[PDB]
Structures are given as structure tokens and as C-alpha cells.
Write a protein that binds this ligand. Structure first.
Ligand code: HEM
Ligand SMILES: [Ca+2]
Ligand SMILES: [Ca+2]
Length: 306
């Protein structure tokens, strides 16, 4: 069983070291908190939160970093290396990369203005990476609501609250133009923009992402508060201003009978959202963890111990 007090004797300063690293990095890279939270998400959705995503290529297995959902998208790996080294110095061979990333995600959310809580700990590190599994399990922005629900259920998160609350991670961070081009100019081969995208916002996004323009250009997920972790993401959805298809579908999908009330509840109360987010975050963090003597306490998050 994972417990929040796992390192209270072996490495009481772990949370503080992780926080200090992120605070320092945020000065030069204001996007890092968002990036780190996303790394934890992509770790947990592939064989559980086992730091499998942190492993680099080997001749026996490919890295998850080359997955369609990670390639030229996932970032912050050097920052994780930095905090890992700092933690290893303070507490040699004690904190797993899986746990380190979980703490980093939580601290990132709090540093960005989100809720503060102690995450369950005790996870151990994988002995391999899972590229095929990542390509299969990571959801995509073009998923319909049923597909989004399928993706979450596939990894163990059955609740619509899991999906709606965790999607709140898009209250900050960036998204490439490439992922909304269809919504802007030719949605579902209709030759027209996505009708669920606010027409005023449509104009703004078209200006940032012109047809035949730089597909790698970055746009903010939350037009209200781009770098602050708050419930503004849901207020946007209510006005048809969700950035990607998967965002807006939580409120506009024909299958959104169960998600609409959740979106409204989170838009109406920061407390309701924050509570739901912590609850869902801990559930995602409890996905098939290696514990006890299973796996290892990786010394270098990029490679399995030898
Ligand atoms: C429900 C399905 C989801 C889909 C389809 C999805 C899709 C995406 C896409 C397309 C990007 C843009 C990547 C890029 O342009 O390079 C992204 C970024 C991001 N996502 Fe999600 N996401 C989902 C769920 C989540 C969850 C559960 C979290 C965390 C709790 C999360 C946190 C983030 C963050 C914080 C970013 C910004 C990262 C950065 O700026 O470096 N996402 N997501
Ligand atoms: Ca994983
Ligand atoms: Ca925000």
C-alpha cells in the first residue's frame, strides 16, 4: 500500500529538494511546472507510475520518448535528472524515480497556485520501457469523448470525475498548432471549422495558427490564466473556448451527459475542483505501482541499474 509518509525517516527533505529545483527552473522556464505534471501523467498511463517514461533507448527496448504522444512534445527530462541527483546526494539510493516524478508533479501544481497535499509514496522503478504500450495507451487530442473515456478506463480510471478533473491539467501549459489545425480549417473532413469552437476565439486561434503556417508554434491551453493552476479551464469550456477537441468534448459531446455537470461544478467552485483534482491525481498515481522489492530504486532515471 502506498503511503504519504514513506520517506519521513529515510529522506524527510525530499519534497523540499524537489520544490527548490522547480522554483529555480521556473525562473528561466515558466513552462516547466506544466511540463512536469504532464510527464507524471504519461508515466502513469503506461504500465503505471513506474518511471518507465524516463528510460532512454537500449538495444533491447525502445524508449517511450519516441511515442506519438511524447516525441517532440514531452519535455523537462534534464530537470528531473537535476532533482534526482540532488536527492541522491541528500539520501543515497532511497527515493525512486517513480516517486520523485510523482512528488515533482504535485509540487509543480502547488507552485503554479494549485492545491497542496502529500502524495502517497512507495513506488518503485521499472526494469524496462514500453513504447508500443505508450502508443496504444496515451490519449490523443482528436479522441471523441467515448474514446477519451475508453482510454482512462483502460488504465484503471473508471470515473468520469477522473477524466474531467484530470483534464484540468490544461489550466496551464502549451499546445502546438498542429493539434488544432483540423478544428480551425477542416474538421472531420467537413471543410469547415469545429462548430463547438467559439467563433470569436476561432479567429484568434487562426491568427496564431494560419493554414500552412508553423505547425510547431505554441499556443496556451488556458486563454484566461496561461500559467496559473486554477479552475479557469472549465469556465473556458462553458463558453466553447476549450483549446483542443478533447477539452471541448467534455462539455459539448453528445455523450457528455455525465461530464457536463462535473465541468459546471468545477467552473463554479475552485474548492470543488481542487478537491476533485487531488482525489483524481492520487487515483492516477495509484495505477499498477511496483512496490516492496519489485523493480528497483533507479540511481540514474535514464537507465536501469546494472
Ligand atoms: C484527457 C486526454 C488528454 C489529451 C488528449 C491530452 C493532450 C495533450 C496535448 C495534445 C498536449 C500538447 C502537447 C504539445 O503540443 O507538445 C498536452 C499538453 C499538456 N497536457 Fe494534456 N492531454 C490529456 C490529459 C492530460 C492530463 C490527465 C494531464 C495531467 C493531469 C495533462 C497535462 C498536460 C499539460 C500540463 C500540458 C502542457 C505541457 C507543456 O506545456 O509542456 N494532460 N496534452
Ligand atoms: Ca510508466
Ligand atoms: Ca489557468
Amino acid at each position: 500500500q502506498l503511503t504519504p509518509t514513506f520517506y519521513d525517516n529515510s529522506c524527510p527533505n525530499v519534497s523540499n529538494i524537489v520544490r527548490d529545483t522547480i522554483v529555480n527552473e521556473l525562473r528561466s522556464d515558466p513552462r516547466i511546472a506544466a511540463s512536469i505534471l504532464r510527464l507524471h501523467f504519461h508515466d502513469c498511463f503506461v504500465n503505471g507510475c513506474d518511471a518507465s517514461i524516463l528510460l532512454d533507448n537500449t538495444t533491447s527496448f525502445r524508449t517511450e520518448k519516441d511515442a506519438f504522444g511524447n516525441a517532440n512534445s514531452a519535455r523537462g527530462f534534464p530537470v528531473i535528472d537535476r532533482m534526482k541527483a540532488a536527492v541522491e546526494s541528500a539520501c543515497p539510493r532511497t527515493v525512486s524515480c517513480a516517486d520523485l516524478l510523482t512528488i515533482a508533479a504535485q509540487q509543480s501544481v502547488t507552485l503554479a497556485g494549485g492545491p497542496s497535499w502529500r502524495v502517497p509514496l512507495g513506488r518503485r522503478d521499472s526494469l524496462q520501457a514500453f513504447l508500443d504500450l505508450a502508443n496504444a495507451n496515451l490519449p490523443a487530442p482528436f479522441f471523441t469523448l467515448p474514446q477519451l473515456k475508453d482510454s482512462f478506463r483502460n488504465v484503471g480510471l473508471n470515473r468520469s470525475s477522473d477524466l474531467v478533473a484530470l483534464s484540468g491539467g490544461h489550466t496551464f501549459g502549451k499546445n502546438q498548432c498542429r493539434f488544432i489545425m483540423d478544428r480551425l480549417y477542416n474538421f472531420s473532413n467537413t471543410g469547415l471549422p469545429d462548430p463547438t469552437l467559439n467563433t470569436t476565439y476561432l479567429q484568434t486561434l487562426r491568427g496564431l495558427c494560419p493554414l500552412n503556417g508553423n505547425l510547431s508554434a505554441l499556443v496556451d491551453f488556458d486563454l484566461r490564466t496561461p500559467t496559473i493552476f486554477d479552475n479557469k479551464y472549465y469556465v473556458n469550456l462553458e463558453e466553447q473556448k476549450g483549446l483542443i477537441q478533447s477539452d471541448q468534448e467534455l462539455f459539448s459531446s453528445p455523450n457528455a451527459t455525465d461530464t457536463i455537470p462535473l465541468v459546471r461544478s468545477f467552473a463554479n467552485s475552485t474548492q470543488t475542483f481542487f478537491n476533485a483534482f487531488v482525489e483524481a491525481m492520487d487515483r492516477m498515481g495509484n495505477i499498477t505501482p511496483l512496490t516492496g522489492t519489485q523493480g528497483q530504486i533507479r540511481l540514474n532515471c535514464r537507465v536501469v541499474n546494472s
